[PDB]
């Protein structure tokens, strides 16, 4: 069964880092060749899996995520690495298995007038657990005695804008990133490799 990675990678709207699109794969035998066939990629370095053994082992479940980050922090999405986007928005497992893909999205995911669409969160209470997703008005009430909840002085909003212009340089232009996590629970058969 061919499952459409054509919707996984090529699309119109990718969400920001604070809400990654979690898509489950349990009813297909995916054609793992787009990594050579789609486009030349900024990041093929990945802690989990090798290109030789992606099809060798019979992998039963796949998760897929898509968002966009800065070109400077493409390597920041990795186990162990710390920073305001890794351990506060999307933290990877310490021994995560899977290979991640990143492509420059400056061709169409960037407006010359400006794109005040994506956001990123700067401060949770501490470093978030890996694979923990939150979408809420988490007003980090920095009160010497607390901001009473809404719409006042000293009340710092959590999410900071992610303004986008194609006139930027390499390392600050938009770079979209998709990650593929591979899981085998104590599980029945759902997905196996092609023959």
């Amino acid at each position: 069964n061919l499952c459409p990675f054509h919707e996984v990678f090529n699309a119109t709207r990718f969400a920001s880092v604070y809400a990654w699109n979690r898509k489950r794969i349990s009813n297909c035998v995916a054609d793992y060749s787009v990594l050579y066939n789609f486009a030349p990629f900024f990041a093929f370095k990945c802690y989990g899996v090798s290109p030789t053994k992606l099809n060798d082992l019979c992998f039963t479940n796949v998760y897929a995520d898509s968002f966009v980050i800065r070109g400077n922090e493409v390597s920041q999405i990795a186990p162990g690495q710390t920073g305001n986007i890794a351990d506060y928005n999307y933290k990877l497992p310490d021994d995560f298995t899977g290979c991640v893909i990143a492509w420059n999205s400056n061709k169409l995911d960037s407006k010359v007038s400006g794109n005040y669409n994506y956001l990123y969160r700067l401060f949770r209470k501490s470093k978030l657990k890996p694979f923990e997703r939150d979408i809420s008005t988490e007003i980090y009430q920095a009160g010497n005695k607390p901001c009473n909840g809404v719409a006042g002085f000293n009340c710092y909003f959590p999410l900071q804008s992610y303004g986008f212009r194609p006139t930027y340089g390499v390392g600050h232009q938009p770079y979209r990133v998709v990650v593929l996590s591979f899981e085998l629970l104590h599980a029945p058969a759902t997905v196996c490799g092609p023959k």
């Binding site: 400006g114 700067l122 401060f123 980090y140 920095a142 010497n144 710092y156 900071q160 804008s161 303004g163 212009r165 006139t167 930027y168 340089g169 390499v170 390392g171 600050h172």
Partner: protein, 592 residues
């Protein structure tokens, strides 16, 4: 609920919005600089007003936070940059009046109109006409009359504006415990940071005075040689034992000497090393002219300009398709944007300014790691110094014939290159007593030993005792001279120029001690030395984060200013200049 961490969070909140609004302001400024249309003027004014308003808002937010005993020694310096509320600390009526005064200052400098009584309606203005008349004509009386009349008609309206400028800025500096505006300008050099690397105001002015004291004899002998050549040209009115007027000094103000090169050149049988004849053959274009500069910066080890910036940058004047400004600028817009803007010719003056601007861009690459609020040089004068180091390397014949550009047969000899060093000595050496003289004037007027009414006698006394220039007509307070400079109306300090000179000579000495190409300083190169590139880039990446004393320790090992590189650089000249300069009078007489 921690307070220092709250301040750090405020720093993050400031810097993110500050950078993404500063890009919006600077792109609109670039759009104004590209095509002159009123849509761009309105956009630039709106963006600048937005940027200033938000900057004032986080300035108030920073002023409300406590500052006592809060140290990461990096966040503290960011807050020291952000604590300053500006000129709105006093009643805002006087601040708005001061900004209106500065607008009037700029407009009346831009419209310093003077015309002859023979043709009052048909005349010329300051910038395009008087400069080329000075650089071409050699008349004593006409240049004297134009100089005197211009200075009188300027000073008559520039005297009271500065006179009530200084009194307001005294109390403006008295806000937040500074003593004078000169002390505030010296506080740009302040390091109240990690102990053992301290820097304050009193030893700053002491260092400037001492370094000029060891500068002084070389300028004195160059001045004597210049006056000897002028007496070989024009000996009639001026006595050969005294000073000379400023209007034969190559500029109306006297802040340059390069226009005296044609009159004062020795060894005239060899004109200067000129290859302008040969781009009839090689046909070099400005884009590939930039390309040898990029190859030069890759050669020393520094990273190269990214390929997209080639179509970001403007590499040629538009021409007749529209009008634009012709000024070599290195625009760092922000968010990693780096553009070069100039009306590009083919001559080596344009090549040299291209090297200087590329040095500016490369330094802008280097300090890109630090946050937005710390994105300037370690002092006010490293931008104009880093490009000035690269200006020296491309001048030597060794660089031209190492890349094969020069005809191979020329090389260098005993008979030449004095004609190359004296050109730099007119460019570099004579500036230093002038900047020291007038900036010491301004700082010591701020110190107050000069009465505010009597600004002419200590002016002319210090000019005779430092730069050795005599006024031929006495001046009262209406004939106000010192306000007529380009930067006095704009209120800019000149310590960046003296400091950049001393700094880039120290840098030349340092980087010629890590390249193995040993000899006198002028004929040594920076090209292709990985250890030298490592030392330079170790300096370059610092930004404003660590203090400038440690930045200068990163290259030379000396905290303070040392003029010994300058003396060693110009001493191949000095073995010969004083020897030919002997049997003449030495020094300046105050009577003449």
């Amino acid at each position: 609920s921690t307070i220092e961490e709250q301040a750090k969070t405020f720093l993050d909140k400031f810097n993110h919005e500050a950078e993404d609004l500063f890009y919006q302001s600077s792109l609109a400024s670039w759009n104004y600089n590209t095509n002159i249309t009123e849509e761009n003027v309105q956009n630039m004014n709106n963006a600048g007003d937005k940027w200033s308003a938000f900057l004032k808002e986080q300035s108030t937010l920073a002023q409300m936070y406590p500052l006592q005993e809060i140290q990461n020694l990096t966040v503290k310096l960011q807050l020291q940059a952000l604590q300053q509320n500006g000129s709105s600390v006093l009643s805002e009526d006087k601040s708005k009046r001061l900004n209106t005064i500065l607008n009037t200052m700029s407009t009346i400098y831009s419209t310093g109109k003077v015309c002859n009584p023979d043709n009052p309606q048909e005349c010329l203005l300051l910038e395009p006409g008087l400069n080329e008349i000075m650089a071409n004509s050699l008349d004593y009386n006409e240049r004297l009359w134009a100089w005197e009349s211009w200075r009188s008609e300027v000073g008559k309206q520039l005297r009271p504006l500065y006179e009530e400028y200084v009194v307001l800025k005294n109390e403006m500096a008295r806000a937040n415990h500074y003593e004078d505006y000169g002390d505030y300008w010296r506080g740009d050099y302040e390091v109240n940071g990690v102990d053992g690397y301290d820097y304050s105001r009193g030893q700053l002015i002491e260092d400037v005075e001492h370094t000029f004291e060891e500068i002084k004899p070389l300028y004195e002998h160059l001045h004597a040689y210049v006056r000897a050549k002028l007496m070989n040209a024009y000996p009639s009115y001026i006595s050969p034992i005294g000073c000379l007027p400023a209007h034969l000094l190559g500029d109306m103000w006297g802040r340059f000497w390069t226009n005296l090169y044609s009159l004062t050149v020795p060894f005239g049988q060899k004109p200067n090393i000129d290859v302008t004849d040969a781009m009839v053959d090689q046909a070099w274009d400005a884009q590939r002219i930039f390309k040898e500069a990029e190859k030069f910066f890759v050669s020393v080890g520094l990273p190269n300009m990214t390929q997209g910036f080639w179509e970001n940058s403007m590499l040629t004047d538009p021409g007749n398709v529209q009008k634009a400004v012709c000024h070599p600028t290195a625009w760092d817009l922000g968010k990693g944007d780096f553009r070069i803007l100039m009306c590009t010719k083919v001559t080596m003056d344009d090549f040299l300014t291209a090297h200087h601007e590329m040095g500016h861009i490369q330094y802008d690459m280097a300090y890109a790691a630090q946050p937005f609020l710390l994105r300037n040089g370690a002092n006010e004068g490293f931008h104009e110094a880093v490009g000035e180091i690269m200006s020296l390397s491309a001048a030597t014949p060794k660089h031209l014939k190492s890349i094969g550009l020069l005809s191979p047969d020329f090389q260098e000899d005993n008979e030449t290159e004095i004609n190359f060093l004296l050109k730099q000595a007119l460019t570099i050496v004579g500036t230093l007593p002038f900047t020291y003289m007038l900036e010491k004037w301004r700082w010591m007027v701020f110190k107050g030993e000069i009465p505010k009414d009597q600004w002419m006698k200590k002016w002319w006394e210090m000019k005779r005792e430092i730069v050795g220039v005599v006024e031929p007509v006495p001046h009262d307070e209406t004939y106000c001279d010192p306000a007529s400079l380009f930067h006095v109306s704009n209120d800019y300090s000149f310590i960046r120029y003296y400091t950049r000179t001393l700094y880039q000579f120290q840098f030349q000495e340092a980087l010629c001690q890590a390249a193995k190409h040993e000899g006198p300083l002028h004929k040594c190169d920076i090209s292709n030395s990985t250890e030298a590139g490592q030392k330079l880039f170790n300096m370059l990446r610092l930004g404003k984060s660590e203090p400038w004393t440690l930045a200068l320790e990163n290259v030379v090992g000396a905290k303070n200013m040392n003029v010994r590189p300058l003396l060693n650089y110009f001493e191949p000249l000095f073995t010969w200049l004083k020897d030919q300069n002997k049997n003449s009078f030495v020094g300046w007489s105050t009577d003449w």
